[PDB]
Design an enzyme around this catalytic site. Sequence first.
Site, PDB file in Angstrom:
ATOM      1  N   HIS A   1      92.169  20.289  86.469  1.00 12.41           N
ATOM      2  CA  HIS A   1      91.260  21.435  86.498  1.00 12.41           C
ATOM      3  C   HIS A   1      90.718  21.742  87.889  1.00 12.41           C
ATOM      4  O   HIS A   1      89.914  22.669  88.003  1.00 12.41           O
ATOM      5  CB  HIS A   1      90.092  21.284  85.513  1.00 12.41           C
ATOM      6  CG  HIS A   1      89.052  20.283  85.923  1.00 12.41           C
ATOM      7  ND1 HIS A   1      88.042  20.571  86.818  1.00 12.41           N
ATOM      8  CD2 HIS A   1      88.807  19.028  85.470  1.00 12.41           C
ATOM      9  CE1 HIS A   1      87.260  19.510  86.952  1.00 12.41           C
ATOM     10  NE2 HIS A   1      87.694  18.564  86.134  1.00 12.41           N
TER      11      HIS A   1
ATOM     12  N   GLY B   1      80.927  17.440  91.120  1.00 14.57           N
ATOM     13  CA  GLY B   1      81.646  16.908  92.261  1.00 14.57           C
ATOM     14  C   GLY B   1      82.221  15.520  92.069  1.00 14.57           C
ATOM     15  O   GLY B   1      82.954  15.049  92.948  1.00 14.57           O
TER      16      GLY B   1
ATOM     17  N   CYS C   1      84.261  14.465  89.554  1.00 17.24           N
ATOM     18  CA  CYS C   1      85.580  14.399  88.936  1.00 17.24           C
ATOM     19  C   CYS C   1      86.587  13.774  89.887  1.00 17.24           C
ATOM     20  O   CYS C   1      86.485  13.903  91.098  1.00 17.24           O
ATOM     21  CB  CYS C   1      86.039  15.785  88.486  1.00 17.24           C
ATOM     22  SG  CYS C   1      85.016  16.422  87.153  1.00 17.24           S
TER      23      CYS C   1
HETATM   24  C1  LIG Z   1      83.970  17.630  87.907  1.00 17.30           C
HETATM   25  O1  LIG Z   1      83.399  17.205  89.143  1.00 17.30           O
HETATM   26  C2  LIG Z   1      82.899  17.980  86.868  1.00 17.30           C
HETATM   27  C3  LIG Z   1      82.006  16.750  86.580  1.00 17.30           C
HETATM   28  C4  LIG Z   1      81.032  17.063  85.451  1.00 17.30           C
HETATM   29  C5  LIG Z   1      80.031  18.105  85.926  1.00 17.30           C
HETATM   30  C6  LIG Z   1      78.643  17.510  85.697  1.00 17.30           C
HETATM   31  N1  LIG Z   1      78.883  16.139  85.288  1.00 17.30           N
HETATM   32  C7  LIG Z   1      80.164  15.870  85.119  1.00 17.30           C
HETATM   33  O2  LIG Z   1      80.606  14.800  84.763  1.00 17.30           O
HETATM   34  N2  LIG Z   1      83.562  18.412  85.655  1.00 17.30           N
HETATM   35  C8  LIG Z   1      83.365  19.650  85.175  1.00 17.30           C
HETATM   36  O3  LIG Z   1      82.503  20.411  85.592  1.00 17.30           O
HETATM   37  C9  LIG Z   1      84.265  20.130  84.083  1.00 17.30           C
HETATM   38  C10 LIG Z   1      85.272  21.091  84.707  1.00 17.30           C
HETATM   39  C11 LIG Z   1      86.360  21.394  83.714  1.00 17.30           C
HETATM   40  C12 LIG Z   1      87.347  22.367  83.824  1.00 17.30           C
HETATM   41  C13 LIG Z   1      88.127  22.308  82.691  1.00 17.30           C
HETATM   42  C14 LIG Z   1      87.626  21.304  81.892  1.00 17.30           C
HETATM   43  O4  LIG Z   1      86.535  20.751  82.530  1.00 17.30           O
HETATM   44  N3  LIG Z   1      83.516  20.802  83.038  1.00 17.30           N
HETATM   45  C15 LIG Z   1      82.519  20.166  82.392  1.00 17.30           C
HETATM   46  O5  LIG Z   1      82.254  18.978  82.571  1.00 17.30           O
HETATM   47  C16 LIG Z   1      81.711  20.996  81.431  1.00 17.30           C
HETATM   48  N4  LIG Z   1      81.769  20.470  80.092  1.00 17.30           N
HETATM   49  C17 LIG Z   1      82.342  21.100  79.071  1.00 17.30           C
HETATM   50  O6  LIG Z   1      83.062  22.087  79.192  1.00 17.30           O
HETATM   51  O7  LIG Z   1      82.068  20.539  77.749  1.00 17.30           O
HETATM   52  C18 LIG Z   1      82.179  21.290  76.530  1.00 17.30           C
HETATM   53  C19 LIG Z   1      81.279  22.512  76.482  1.00 17.30           C
HETATM   54  C20 LIG Z   1      80.087  22.468  75.757  1.00 17.30           C
HETATM   55  C21 LIG Z   1      79.273  23.601  75.696  1.00 17.30           C
HETATM   56  C22 LIG Z   1      79.638  24.768  76.357  1.00 17.30           C
HETATM   57  C23 LIG Z   1      80.825  24.815  77.076  1.00 17.30           C
HETATM   58  C24 LIG Z   1      81.647  23.698  77.128  1.00 17.30           C
HETATM   59  C25 LIG Z   1      80.254  21.014  81.873  1.00 17.30           C
HETATM   60  C26 LIG Z   1      80.159  21.474  83.321  1.00 17.30           C
HETATM   61  C27 LIG Z   1      79.421  21.905  80.955  1.00 17.30           C
END
Ligand SMILES: *[C@H](O)[C@H](C[C@@H]1CCNC1=O)NC(=O)[C@H](Cc1ccco1)NC(=O)[C@@H](NC(=O)OCc1ccccc1)C(C)C
Lengths: 306, 306
Positions: B41, B143, B145
């Site tokens: 991603h 940041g 990931c």
């Molecule tokens: C990468 O650095 C980052 C690390 C996350 C951010 C904060 N703490 C962490 O561990 N990962 C992401 O931001 C990740 C990017 C991504 C792209 C495609 C798939 O993931 N997205 C997330 O972690 C989302 N989570 C998520 O989508 O969970 C399900 C959801 C629930 C409710 C509404 C929408 C989605 C968060 C940034 C919300």
Amino acid sequence: SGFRKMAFPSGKVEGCMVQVTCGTTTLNGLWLDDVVYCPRHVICTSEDMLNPNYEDLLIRKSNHNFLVQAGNVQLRVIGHSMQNCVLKLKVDTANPKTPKYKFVRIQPGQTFSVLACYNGSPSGVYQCAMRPNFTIKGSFLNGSCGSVGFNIDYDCVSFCYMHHMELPTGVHAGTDLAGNFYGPFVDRQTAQAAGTDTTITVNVLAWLYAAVINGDRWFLNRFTTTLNDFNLVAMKYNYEPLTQDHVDILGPLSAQTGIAVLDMCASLKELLQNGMNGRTILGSALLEDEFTPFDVVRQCSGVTFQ
Amino acid sequence: SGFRKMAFPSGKVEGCMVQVTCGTTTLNGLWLDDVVYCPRHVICTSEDMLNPNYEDLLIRKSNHNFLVQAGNVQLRVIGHSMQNCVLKLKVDTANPKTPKYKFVRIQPGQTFSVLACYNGSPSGVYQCAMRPNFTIKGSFLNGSCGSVGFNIDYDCVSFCYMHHMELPTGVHAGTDLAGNFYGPFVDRQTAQAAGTDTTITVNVLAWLYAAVINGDRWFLNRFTTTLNDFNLVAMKYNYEPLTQDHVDILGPLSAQTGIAVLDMCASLKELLQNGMNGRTILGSALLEDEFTPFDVVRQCSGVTFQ
Ligand SMILES: *[C@H](O)[C@H](C[C@@H]1CCNC1=O)NC(=O)[C@H](Cc1ccco1)NC(=O)[C@@H](NC(=O)OCc1ccccc1)C(C)C
Ligand SMILES: *[C@H](O)[C@H](C[C@@H]1CCNC1=O)NC(=O)[C@H](Cc1ccco1)NC(=O)[C@@H](NC(=O)OCc1ccccc1)C(C)C
């Protein structure tokens, strides 16, 4: 988000760990430039341990009596001296992995990572605090002496602790890197009691802020208090008095959560006198006190180190 | 003695961390030999986040679109490919700090250390477990990931986890190093629920043994039980069934303490039905479940790694 007892990454310290063997004793040493630091009770024998005269024992010894392994590379001792309770082994090879470093003495309530070592080899890393009675609650087995505690400032390793001995209550005691014990302990197998410990109030408050920052907040309230009235309660429950200086360090967290320090004191007062009543905070059922304000800010804001 | 949530020393992993920047997205990559692994991603954009088609998004990117920082040394991408949810960036320099390593997929209940990183720089190291619902309760910020989880096996780093995403309950989800997520999750910004977590019974028991080994005996009793009757109570307390296999892994701890596994099960049953009545075990007021039997044996007998 999330909150974990996080250690500093330990790579710069693993590069400094050596094995020091003298007589029947084997412990760890810290090799920086051409100096290997280690506990002087390496020079003891099983019958020397009671009330040794280390000045006599050290002058009793030669450079060749000290075997120093840096893995499969044997380091030659070219000199030695004693500074308080640490032995300084001068060797003919400067550690090419020597990081930028300092020797710092920490205060009670402050935290540090410990690289537990055996036979010069790192076994694990964990976070500790200097308890108010100058013990630490770590995890140390026979052979772990010479293990060090450290913080990291961007690129600089601040060494603060060396392991020496374990007290009968299972807690641990040691020195800064200049060889001076934390607390009233001495490097003698003689009965010594740790002294009564107390809870680090400012650290509990910091951890309650981390909780809020992470969405735990069942515990807050509308009430406030004054520093004085709160400290009457801190005495009753065996807590470090809270200073205005402490209130000042908690400023940043207070401003980020929008909860006044004395408001979160009211919260701690209600937790103390009523307990948690079946609920947890940050996955703990106890009031956790081994996170400084720095620890919280660093973790809840992603500080890194190069 | 003492017992701490102990991470593996993180030096071998710190030497593999890099920064990977694509578009407006920066995250960490793991650099082994001439391959840089990172979450796919990274190729998403703020509006791509929703239901992306990574096959489309990738074929449509160029090697030069990937910035890879190895500190101040910029790595040139010479090829790229996607294995499930990880991106594999072929670079023209093999990491001279590459350790012996393995990619492993862990089962629920197993533990690992996490080196939390930002912009390719390590921020801290901590221990976690793979929860029974294939989340991990980590500490992760934007940041982070590309941070990995790992175990160390004498000299060999077994990588098991790469961080991708945070679920709404604050917990975290990811992949093995071959890109396959743990659990039913997908790398898509859409509503996904972790599913009900349960307590890792075999790990609670192992920690109870650690407690005995360290002199916390305040929870033992004369009673015994059968695996059947005990599992009837695990059921009620949202605990993970105990298998005869689980009983067999606990053998060494049982033999070292002299407490039969099903006696310890009788103790846990009484702790479950009656609580701890205001007392602590190994400094916790909850039954801890993120120590495997191997973690307890490691720590209570001092296994080292070279
Ligand atoms: C990468 O650095 C980052 C690390 C996350 C951010 C904060 N703490 C962490 O561990 N990962 C992401 O931001 C990740 C990017 C991504 C792209 C495609 C798939 O993931 N997205 C997330 O972690 C989302 N989570 C998520 O989508 O969970 C399900 C959801 C629930 C409710 C509404 C929408 C989605 C968060 C940034 C919300
Ligand atoms: C060094 O590797 C080792 C680390 C200890 C061993 C087990 N857990 C640890 O952390 N330290 C010692 O063995 C140390 C050697 C020594 C010589 C002179 C000073 O230290 N000795 C101890 O830690 C003793 N502790 C001790 O003497 O405490 C006071 C005491 C109470 C009752 C009776 C006699 C003495 C322990 C090994 C008991």
